[PDB]
């Protein structure tokens, strides 16, 4: 991160985990200029990276990325048969997990209106993100710039690029507050080009530490079988007789 090394969260399913801090003391500030762009790694094939193919927003990764949930309603009568299930997916996009039952009763008004086909996916994601449950979990307990970085990662599938993008959202929090930041992200151009009013947000970009963590692992990195191509000995071919 342009700020200290402790401003990078762990990219896990449901998070808000910042391991660097008072208890760890593993802290590395570095001089990052105002103009600077982080090298992000696309969750999918390299070439759909959006930095040299800005036109590849809206375009599917395929089996190399996460699954994308869309409320299509394409039946020969155009009925929606996944209302129950797009709603479950949004809770994971916003919260990462299923909130407790006593927590969810305050959000039943939002959920009932979506299951009746009266809310878009974008307005559902907005209603969950500006709630008292999301605020008490990810706004109030956190450093203001750590919270912006985490929230920016849940709604847009990537961390921020640099200081220009972070002093920007940081100024909206200075004047407007928690709701000003959630609205300015969702109403961005990157949101509406990637998700529209139809698609649940999914993970799009990662960091070197995140990829190094997922890959570079035993069970994921092949036990040297690309090399080690086993072939027949020549002295064994010279003494072989017929096959059948």
């Amino acid at each position: 991160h342009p700020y200290g090394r402790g401003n990078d969260p762990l990219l896990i399913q449901f998070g808000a985990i910042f391991p660097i801090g008072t208890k760890n003391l593993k802290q590395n500030p570095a001089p990052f200029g105002k103009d600077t762009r982080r090298l992000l790694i696309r969750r999918g094939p390299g070439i759909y990276n959006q930095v040299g193919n800005p036109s590849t927003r809206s375009v599917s990764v395929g089996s190399l990325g996460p699954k994308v949930f869309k409320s299509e309603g394409i039946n020969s009568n155009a009925q929606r048969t996944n209302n129950e299930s797009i709603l479950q997916a949004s809770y994971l996009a916003v919260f990462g997990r299923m909130i407790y039952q006593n927590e969810r009763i305050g959000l039943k008004g939002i959920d009932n209106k979506f299951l009746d086909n009266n809310l878009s996916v974008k307005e559902l994601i907005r209603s969950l993100a500006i709630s008292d449950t999301f605020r008490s979990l990810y706004w109030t307990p956190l450093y203001v710039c750590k919270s912006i970085e985490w929230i920016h990662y849940r709604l847009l599938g990537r961390p921020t690029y640099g200081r220009q993008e972070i002093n920007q959202y940081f100024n909206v929090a200075y004047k407007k507050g928690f709701v000003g930041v959630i609205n300015s992200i969702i109403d961005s151009v990157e949101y509406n080009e990637c998700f529209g009013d139809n698609i649940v947000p999914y993970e799009r970009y990662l960091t070197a530490n995140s990829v190094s963590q997922r890959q570079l692992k035993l069970g994921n990195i092949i036990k040297s079988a690309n090399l080690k191509p086993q072939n027949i000995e020549k002295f064994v071919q010279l003494g072989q007789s017929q096959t059948n």
């Binding site: 762990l10 990219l11 896990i12 399913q13 998070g15 985990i17 910042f18 391991p19 801090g21 208890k23 760890n24 997990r97 299923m98 407790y100 963590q213 997922r214 692992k217 069970g219 994921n220 092949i222 079988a225 690309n226 191509p229």
Partner: protein, 161 residues
């Protein structure tokens, strides 16, 4: 994620090779045990709540970690830990169906020790709860499926330790 079939195909494709006799050996091995795997996965989906309840009851239900001042003392923490155990059981079932623990590496173990260390969650008690869950699960699914499931349970415990 990659299952046994995906792993064999990848090992063959990373050398420009066609699937030879050893690949056929591994593929037949997976295809013979697939039906047992489906049976075990169904049975585990049937009894997840009871498995978690019994593992918690035998492992940490009456210990001191649940008393005032314990890790899982308040109701928030109790609910959070039972949700964690549900995660572990579901992902072990996925790994058993796939015949490959790569999903555990990608979706579970990546950054888990660091999260638990930042939160203060005791790792030894978690590993012991997973071990108790392994007992009940092998119990319920029988010997062969229990060994299959215990493979991935021990994989999670080794990745956590």
């Amino acid at each position: 994620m990659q299952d046994a079939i995906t792993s064999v195909i990848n090992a063959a494709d990373v050398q420009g090779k066609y699937l030879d006799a050893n690949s056929v050996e591994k593929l037949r091995g997976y295809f013979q045990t697939g039906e047992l795997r489906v049976r075990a996965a169904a049975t585990i989906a049937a009894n997840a709540a009871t498995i978690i309840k019994e593992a918690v009851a035998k492992s940490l239900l009456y210990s001191d970690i649940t008393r005032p001042g314990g890790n899982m003392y308040t109701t928030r923490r109790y609910a959070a830990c039972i949700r964690d155990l549900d995660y572990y059981l579901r992902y072990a079932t996925y790994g058993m169906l796939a015949g490959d623990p790569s999903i555990l590496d990608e979706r579970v173990l990546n950054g888990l020790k660091e999260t638990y260390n930042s939160l203060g969650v005791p790792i030894g008690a978690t590993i012991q709860a997973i071990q108790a869950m392994k007992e009940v699960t092998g119990s319920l699914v029988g010997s062969d499926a229990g060994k299959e499931m215990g493979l991935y349970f021990d994989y999670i415990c080794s990745g956590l330790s």
